[PDB]
Amino acid sequence: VSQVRQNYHSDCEAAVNRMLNLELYASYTYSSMYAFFDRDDVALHNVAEFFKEHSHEEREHAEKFMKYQNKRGGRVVLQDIKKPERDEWGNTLEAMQAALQLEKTVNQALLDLHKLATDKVDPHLCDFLESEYLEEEVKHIKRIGDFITNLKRLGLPENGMGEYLFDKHSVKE
Amino acid sequence: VSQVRQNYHSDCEAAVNRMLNLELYASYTYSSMYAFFDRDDVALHNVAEFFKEHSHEEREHAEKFMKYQNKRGGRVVLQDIKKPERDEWGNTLEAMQAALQLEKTVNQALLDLHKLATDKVDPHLCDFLESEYLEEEVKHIKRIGDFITNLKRLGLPENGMGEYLFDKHSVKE
Amino acid sequence: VSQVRQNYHSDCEAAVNRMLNLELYASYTYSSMYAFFDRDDVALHNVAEFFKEHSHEEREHAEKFMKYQNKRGGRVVLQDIKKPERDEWGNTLEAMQAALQLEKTVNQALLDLHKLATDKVDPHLCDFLESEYLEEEVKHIKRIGDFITNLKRLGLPENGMGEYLFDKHSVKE
Amino acid sequence: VSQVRQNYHSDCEAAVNRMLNLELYASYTYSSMYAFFDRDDVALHNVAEFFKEHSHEEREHAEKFMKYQNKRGGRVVLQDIKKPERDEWGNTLEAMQAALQLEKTVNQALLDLHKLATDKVDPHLCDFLESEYLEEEVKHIKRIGDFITNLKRLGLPENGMGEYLFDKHSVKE
Numbered sequence: 001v002s003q004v005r006q007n008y009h010s011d012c013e014a015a016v017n018r019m020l021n022l023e024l025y026a027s028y029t030y031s032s033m034y035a036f037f038d039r040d041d042v043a044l045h046n047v048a049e050f051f052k053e054h055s056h057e058e059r060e061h062a063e064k065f066m067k068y069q070n071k072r073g074g075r076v077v078l079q080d081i082k083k084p085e086r087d088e089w090g091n092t093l094e095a096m097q098a099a100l101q102l103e104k105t106v107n108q109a110l111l112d113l114h115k116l117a118t119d120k121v122d123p124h125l126c127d128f129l130e131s132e133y134l135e136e137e138v139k140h141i142k143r144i145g146d147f148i149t150n151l152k153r154l155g156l157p158e159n160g161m162g163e164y165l166f167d168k169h170s171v172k173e
Numbered sequence: 174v175s176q177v178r179q180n181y182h183s184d185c186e187a188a189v190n191r192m193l194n195l196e197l198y199a200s201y202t203y204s205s206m207y208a209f210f211d212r213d214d215v216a217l218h219n220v221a222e223f224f225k226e227h228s229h230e231e232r233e234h235a236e237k238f239m240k241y242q243n244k245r246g247g248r249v250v251l252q253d254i255k256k257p258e259r260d261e262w263g264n265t266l267e268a269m270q271a272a273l274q275l276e277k278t279v280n281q282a283l284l285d286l287h288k289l290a291t292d293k294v295d296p297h298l299c300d301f302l303e304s305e306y307l308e309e310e311v312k313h314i315k316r317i318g319d320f321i322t323n324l325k326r327l328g329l330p331e332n333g334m335g336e337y338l339f340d341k342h343s344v345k346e
Numbered sequence: 347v348s349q350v351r352q353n354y355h356s357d358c359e360a361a362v363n364r365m366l367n368l369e370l371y372a373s374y375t376y377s378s379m380y381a382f383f384d385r386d387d388v389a390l391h392n393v394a395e396f397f398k399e400h401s402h403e404e405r406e407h408a409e410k411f412m413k414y415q416n417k418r419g420g421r422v423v424l425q426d427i428k429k430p431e432r433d434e435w436g437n438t439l440e441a442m443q444a445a446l447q448l449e450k451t452v453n454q455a456l457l458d459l460h461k462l463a464t465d466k467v468d469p470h471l472c473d474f475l476e477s478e479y480l481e482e483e484v485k486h487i488k489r490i491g492d493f494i495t496n497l498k499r500l501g502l503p504e505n506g507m508g509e510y511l512f513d514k515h516s517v518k519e
Numbered sequence: 520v521s522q523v524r525q526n527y528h529s530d531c532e533a534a535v536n537r538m539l540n541l542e543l544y545a546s547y548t549y550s551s552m553y554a555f556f557d558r559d560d561v562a563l564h565n566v567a568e569f570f571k572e573h574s575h576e577e578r579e580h581a582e583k584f585m586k587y588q589n590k591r592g593g594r595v596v597l598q599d600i601k602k603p604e605r606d607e608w609g610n611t612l613e614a615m616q617a618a619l620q621l622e623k624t625v626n627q628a629l630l631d632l633h634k635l636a637t638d639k640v641d642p643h644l645c646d647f648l649e650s651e652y653l654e655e656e657v658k659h660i661k662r663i664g665d666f667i668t669n670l671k672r673l674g675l676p677e678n679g680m681g682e683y684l685f686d687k688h689s690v691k692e
């Protein structure tokens with residue numbers, strides 16, 4: 001084993017690699033959303049830029065797992081980054097609904113990793129998850145839920161004026 | 174009696190303690206409104222922050238009565254702060270209507286205290302009320318009434334787009 | 347359930363609401379202490395301002411629980427804020443002794459909530475408690491204990507000169 | 520009558536002149552206290568300077584009544600400024616006790632003038648009293664009472680060390 005490795009279970013190492021792939025998957029889905037909202041026949045630029053920012057964030061989340069793996073003496077093992085589930089995202093409401101589920105999927109995986117870390121008596125990995133990931137997920141989920149609420153209030157999906165207003169007044173940088 | 178006490182009727186002292194409790198009650202009701210508008214299924218953040226600010230104001234109003242009581246040689250006597258009348262506040266219109274009635278209840282109590290102070294020939298307490306409270310109440314009542322007018326114009330309670338517009342254009346910090 | 351809610355047990359949600367009430371209760375007790383030490387026949391202003399500051403802190407602690415509840419998709423439910431146990435607080439020693447017990451009551455409730463969160467496998471709530479509350483409690487308890495030690499050294503309750511010296515040299519802003 | 524005079528009763532004009540004399544009397548008493556505490560066999564300089572400051576304040580209070588009288592079209596009529604009741608003031612406690620009674624005498628006279636003004640339906644004179652005098656009296660009375668409390672706590676009159684400590688830690692500029 002690595003000279004640095006101490007109290008780091010094989011199962012946690014593998015789970016970190018799986019998590020990294022999921023972060024990368026989330027990044028790629030948000031890129032798809034960005035591109036959709038930048039289409040000339042969609043054209044909700046502030047929405048698009050929100051998704052772009054989230055794509056970037058998720059990619060940083062992935063980088064931080066790679067660094068974590070090496071710090072603990074584990075070995076980064078990459079897998080294919082699967083393409084997003086959809087090619088087209090309907091409208092701002094549908095996209096936000098998809099983003100909420102994505103975030104909850106990410107969160108569940110983080111929570112599962114934390115439970116594994118707990119089981120294996122790995123306080124360092126717990127702390128990393130709690131300090132760098134779990135609160136950010138709560139924040140994202142809350143923000144997106146709040147957006148959904150507003151989109152529904154604004155009459156989505158039918159009310160185009162409402163969709164326009166949201167893009168112009170909600171999606172603050 | 175206190176060495177400082179001069180021209181301060183027992184009835185005014187007691188009425189000051191009652192008023193203090195009412196200020197605290199008002200603060201707590203506005204906190205409830207804040208929390209309601211911060212819910213993920215409500216999500217009107219600027220509305221929420223308006224109520225939060227008013228909660229803070231009312232708590233300062235209470236502190237100022239405590240200081241006043243001691244300055245005059247009276248004794249602060251606290252009672253339970255009753256929970257707000259509702260757990261849920263419907264929508265921005267219903268909440269603003271409740272806030273208007275709350276402010277008018279506060280104002281009536283202030284006016285009643287002023288009449289007591291007058292009756293007891295206490296110019297100092299009159300002046301305090303006039304200089305620190307009565308004008309602020311008029312301002313609040315006016316602001317909230319103006320909001321109600323606008324909320325009705327915007328189609329509340331039914332018109333969700335109108336509610337959204339209000340949150341984004343009216344509730345200035 | 348709320349669209350945001352994920353891994354948040356009903357029991358934890360209720361316990362958060364109870365905790366919030368206790369923070370508010372602590373705030374109100376410290377306000378009472380402030381008012382007592384501001385009395386003309388007590389007149390220990392720096393002591394009074396220490397308690398005032400703690401009142402404000404506790405109220406901020408309460409606000410942070412309200413925000414936490416909403417972030418997790420729970421629902422804030424308020425109860426009456428009970429009046430403090432005493433109307434009068436004796437002297438600086440008695441008050442500090444009461445404040446120590448108050449802080450320990452708060453701490454015990456936080457520790458109990460953490461144990462519940464642990465039992466329910468809620469790392470997010472653990473982290474919140476550990477990062478925002480538990481260390482602050484240790485600090486407060488230590489500070490107040492240190493004050494008690496000094497008050498006893500200074501001859502409280504009998505030694506008025508000692509009480510005066512404490513107010514003028516210990517209770518630093 | 521003066522060309523400016525409007526709604527100004529002869530009784531109020533005379534009462535203003537009496538009040539002015541009382542302000543001047545208060546000033547002169549505080550000067551006496553200053554001189555006593557500056558004696559080489561008393562030597563409590565910070566105490567002395569507190570009284571000096573109050574002497575100056577009272578003299579400004581008198582000036583403001585003179586200006587008020589002329590503004591309303593009354594005529595300033597001066598009387599002798601009587602010497603203070605004592606030549607010697609004992610100690611810091613005795614002096615503060617005398618200052619408390621002096622302030623309460625001043626306050627009573629102000630309150631009496633306000634009642635006269637009320638009776639004569641003179642809102643301008645009411646307002647002047649409330650805005651320029653009555654709150655300052657409450658503040659002074661409170662401050663001095665607080666000092667008395669502390670002086671008693673410190674063991675006055677017998678405890679010279681306590682008197683010294685008060686001069687060095689209480690009588691802030």
Ligand SMILES: [Cl-]
Pocket residue numbers: 005006007008009
């Ligand atoms: Cl290992």
Ligand SMILES: [Cl-]
Pocket residue numbers: 085086087088
């Ligand atoms: Cl598709």
Ligand SMILES: [Cl-]
Pocket residue numbers: 130131132133134135136137
């Ligand atoms: Cl985080």
Ligand SMILES: [Cl-]
Pocket residue numbers: none
């Ligand atoms: Cl706009």
Ligand SMILES: [Cl-]
Pocket residue numbers: 178179180181182
């Ligand atoms: Cl009285």
Ligand SMILES: [Cl-]
Pocket residue numbers: 258259260261
């Ligand atoms: Cl309700």
Ligand SMILES: [Cl-]
Pocket residue numbers: 303304305306307308309310
């Ligand atoms: Cl006002």
Ligand SMILES: [Cl-]
Pocket residue numbers: 351352353354355
């Ligand atoms: Cl849940």
Ligand SMILES: [Cl-]
Pocket residue numbers: 431432433434
């Ligand atoms: Cl009691």
Ligand SMILES: [Cl-]
Pocket residue numbers: 476477478479480481482483
């Ligand atoms: Cl902490």
Ligand SMILES: [Cl-]
Pocket residue numbers: none
């Ligand atoms: Cl010192």
Ligand SMILES: [Cl-]
Pocket residue numbers: 524525526527528
């Ligand atoms: Cl006239």
Ligand SMILES: [Cl-]
Pocket residue numbers: 604605606607
């Ligand atoms: Cl004499």
Ligand SMILES: [Cl-]
Pocket residue numbers: 649650651652653654655656
């Ligand atoms: Cl004044």
Ligand SMILES: [Co+2]
Pocket residue numbers: 045049
């Ligand atoms: Co752009």
Ligand SMILES: [Co+2]
Pocket residue numbers: 023026057058061106
């Ligand atoms: Co992520």
